[PDB]
């Protein structure tokens, strides 16, 4: 179906222990394809998917050049942010940046995004029109004034509507086997006594791709959302994902309880039962 390309950047200051740690990764949907780490020896943007390996030396040289330019930008940001917030030289702080584009089923531009965080909280974000900014506090207002005066939004919009979508389509084509696939979850439920009066029912979804999934428990058709323990969707390590949902029920009531699985790989949503 639909697709996304996203770059993620994390810079962490390390005061009196050298320069900040910078890590960049790029994803198409839930498949990583590149990385850069400022502490690594290579000092190169590196391949992390088989279908990006075919990119020639101009790609590798230019992507390394650009990622190093992003790293320098964040080095400056960390100093500026400490000034904006009247913070001391002492403590470690974190800047995060994410940008990228979505396309539909037909691979045409759906939407673009470009967002910053400082110390885990929204700082400034490009709005959906790609023409204006949401600044989360007074310090991010200062950035907004500067980014408006410099016409930063216009430069981002041209990238997100053009280059971003251009490279996404290219990746979807070259890595079609990996990227344009759907692996439906293999589903089952497990049952284990916790005492002589209660049992854990755990609904499992395995070996699925993409990561987006919904798992829910119903009792006599009623959602059991506050009684459900739902783990974060986790990577198997082979390019697929896993998730579970559990409820603890009275022994004897198992047949009231059903697990409900939705995933784009399923021809229909599944209902799993204890009878």
């Amino acid at each position: 179906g639909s697709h996304s390309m996203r770059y993620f950047f994390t810079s962490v200051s390390r005061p009196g222990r050298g320069e900040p740690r910078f890590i960049a990764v790029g994803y198409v949907d839930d498949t990583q394809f590149v990385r850069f780490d400022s502490d690594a020896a290579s000092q190169r943007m590196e391949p992390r998917a088989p279908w990006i390996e075919q990119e020639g030396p101009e790609y590798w040289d230019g992507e390394t050049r650009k990622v190093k330019a992003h790293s320098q930008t964040h080095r400056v940001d960390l100093g500026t942010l400490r000034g904006y917030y009247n913070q001391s030289e002492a403590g470690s702080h974190t800047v995060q940046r994410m940008y990228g584009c979505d396309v539909g089923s037909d691979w045409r531009f759906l939407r673009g995004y470009h967002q910053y965080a400082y110390d885990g909280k929204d700082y400034i974000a490009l709005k959906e029109d790609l023409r204006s900014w949401t600044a989360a506090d007074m310090a991010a207002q200062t950035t907004k004034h500067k980014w408006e005066a410099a016409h930063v939004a216009e430069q981002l919009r041209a990238y997100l509507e053009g280059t971003c979508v251009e490279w996404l389509r290219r990746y979807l084509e070259n890595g079609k086997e990996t990227l344009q696939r759907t692996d439906a979850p293999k589903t089952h439920m497990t049952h284990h006594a916790v005492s002589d009066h209660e049992a854990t029912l755990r609904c499992w979804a395995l070996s699925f791709y993409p990561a987006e999934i919904t798992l829910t428990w119903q009792r006599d058709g009623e959602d059991q959302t506050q009684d459900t323990e739902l783990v974060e969707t986790r990577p198997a390590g082979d390019g697929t994902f896993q998730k579970w949902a559990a409820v603890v029920v009275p022994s004897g009531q198992e047949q009231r309880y059903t697990c409900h699985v939705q995933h784009e790989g399923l021809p229909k949503p599944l209902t799993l039962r204890w009878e």
Binding site: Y7, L81, Y84, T143
Partner: peptide, 7 residues
């Protein structure tokens, strides 16, 4: 493949 910025 990456984007031509400081806060």
């Amino acid at each position: 493949x990456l984007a031509x910025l400081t806060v």
